[model samples]
Target: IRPRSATTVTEWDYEADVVVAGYGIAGVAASIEAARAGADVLVLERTSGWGGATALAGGFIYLGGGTPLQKACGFDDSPENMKTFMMAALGPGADEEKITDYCEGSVEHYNWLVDCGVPFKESFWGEPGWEPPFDDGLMYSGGENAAPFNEIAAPAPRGHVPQMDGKRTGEKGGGYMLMKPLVETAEKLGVRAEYDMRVQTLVTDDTGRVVGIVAKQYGKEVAVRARRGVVLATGSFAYNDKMIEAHAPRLIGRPGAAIEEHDGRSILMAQALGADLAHMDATEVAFVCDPQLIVRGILVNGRGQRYVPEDTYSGRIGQMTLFHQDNQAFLIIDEASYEEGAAATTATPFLRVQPKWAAETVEELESDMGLPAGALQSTVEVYNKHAAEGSDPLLHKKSEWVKPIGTPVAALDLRGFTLGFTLGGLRTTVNSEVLHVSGEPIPGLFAAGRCTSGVCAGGYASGTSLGDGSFYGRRAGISAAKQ
Candidate 1:
């Protein structure tokens, strides 16, 4: 039997030139921009909170191509350079046309955010010589084995992390930095933001163009009409397990961060009206070792042994490789490694998730982990031998090897953890139109942010999602209004 529309039983009343679902960065951005474009707008959100993951994440906005911060840092940039870098990192995975479109317009969109009074930080420091987790081409500039695609280079750091704090230095949190100004600006702009309300469907005319929406507010169905268009800024289905399973089967029923509120129903709402689904398989899976369920660390798989320089990006690659190796591996780290900042207890944010310890002998460790007899002893012995010889045959790590395993060796100090950020969802065009299964545009309907695909097909870029909201949200707004 065909499942009924999720909102078939509810009813209420309202109207506007545009109705936007989800008060996330994309939703709010589009609403504000649409209002600026002279359209009457109504904003709807399922959760009680207005901000989506944007408010939750570190508030770093990637501003490439000669942003003010770049000029201040004395680095050169251009749209072409940004485009080149993106092509190398994202490759054929992303929609180059949309990325190209976004590149052409991103700087201007960023400048507009600045003009609208969003606070940003000026990084006088040079680009840190650290490799990003998703390989954005910045790594090859000063590193060896540079690939042919490593032509793009940033004049300065690409992210314009917001300065939410008056105290300079480490007082800034990226999540708060970006969100504060956005919330403030949105309230100042007079957009009708109704929190704790979830949109169920887009009301359409006989011709199939969106007329409005049906939203659940205060335990009742509120019908909101958008004479021009309705936008699906409901963000991505990351927290939706069923959707995750249906689209990204590899992650079905896995233990991870789940926000309970998002259930992939919105995607269904749009799809019932003939919206198309895009590349739903691609994901940003976290590869970290899980110890006592406290934290998950990434394991580098070099001949069934840990390898690679210890770092966040390397850890991510390690985690992906581990998943490819049957969802199990050892995250070998000693207590001294923890002290040296290569590892830390779970109390700290970002660089957290320490290892667990149990037993006192290598034999006990092997039994605890159910490995073959002597396997633990052999693994550790080989690792120590390589460390003593100052040559890591496994990962070819350039850094010095340090084993912190103390006496008794019975602690569960070594564990495997996993954390993933998905890069999957429905595909859309440059204008942010969600397509139908037959590959046609669903008129009067659009999407942005993690809910839809194409922005980061080549690879993930930090701050790219916020930039995507600004870029595609503009297009979605304009298209929804004019459609």
Candidate 2:
């Protein structure tokens, strides 16, 4: 069913000043902000309970701009530096206004989350993996220290995760820790929530302004009226095969980040009203190797040529392997590095796959892997020559991450079905106002998170979803409340 005209509704079964769709980080933030602004907020969730994709995360909220956590971690940061890095990293055509606004107010958002009862350990986790196993408050969620980005801006660890002690892999403990306090705080603010209420379509007036939503619960249709506005915080269309084929066909067959509820219904509903989408082809691809281990080795494509910095963001690495290498990439590591990854507990799962080919020399392994005889040899020769000289001018891997592996080498297929999520979404202003095709705000309509291409458009940092969703969700909430 499509969005029904407001005139068709016979009666409103529920009413609120602001109605938020979805119960993830964005929806909760919208609810809390609206409620605090004296708006009666009702959040409708498709699931049996709260926590959307935000609950399945590593719980890194990319907040920097000199937050207290950054300060505690002994880092001096500025919004300009953050913006510079993002402008370069999220580029070819990055959204400067949205990024600018987010970075400028990052510290404030950090403080707000802290005030909202989200616990943060005043410590830093300088680990190689994207998700830390402890409650450390900060990490280099973005590869800030990597070349290119580091050249553009002074590096700082901006990924702020909630305090989760003894976090285990695959438990999603970080996301749980993040959502717990957010839901509690929103509820404490008297924000009403209805779970298992699957939203079907939007309810709009003759002027095309969103007024409410129609939902299904227990095989019944229910209309909810919002006196002020409605915020569409429903996430992306990661699981929607049709949508993926249309927008991001490369992401097909990859594991999507969303649960089933993130079916791009919000994007379709808004598009029916002439909404415009941004970065519709963008996606986040996650490489399987723990970059920490890969940094100790090397990565090559089918042609046996080094392609990317091993120490950059894992997702970036995945994108390069997919688009640049056509999924014909392999991780070449020495026996010692393989031993360390293989000996790890489940807490560190990747970098442990049995090498498809192993040999005492690079050329021997290449011959077994069925590559051209001298291609791998030439690549290894250049790699070792530079590593011995303490430089990596070719791929820009930092000197610290620069290393050589010519002998006793093994290769692992970097393709563990790289996990992914759609980054292309509805276009919105910095305030999370859904924009129309005519370059005007869709009245009474706001969106954030994966549903809207707010942050992480062209490139992404690990915490950007939780970070931008929560940050701009407040903007959506505040605006929707006053509408």
- Return the clash pairs for model 2, or none: none
Residue lDDT tens for model 1, 339-443:
444332221234444445455665676677666776666767776676666654555433233332443443323224444445566667888887887788876
> The CA-based lDDT of model 1 is what?
0.59
Residue 483 in candidate 1, Cα distance off native in Å? 6.3
Model 2 C-alpha lDDT per residue in residues 1-483, reported as the tens digit of each score: 577999999999889999999999999999999999999999998888888777777788988889999998899899999998888887668798999999999999999998988988888876577576567778887889886788889999998888887664344657778788989999899999887788889999988889999999767999999999899998999888899999988888885575878799999989988899999888888777666666777889989999988888777888778877888788888998778755643334644456778898887888988888799889989889989987889989988777677468988876553668888899999878999999999998999888999777677788888888999999999999994
Per-prediction TM-score? 0.76, 0.97
Q: In terms of TM-score, how similar is model 1 to the real structure? A: 0.76
Clashes (N, CA, C under 3 Å) per candidate:
41, 0
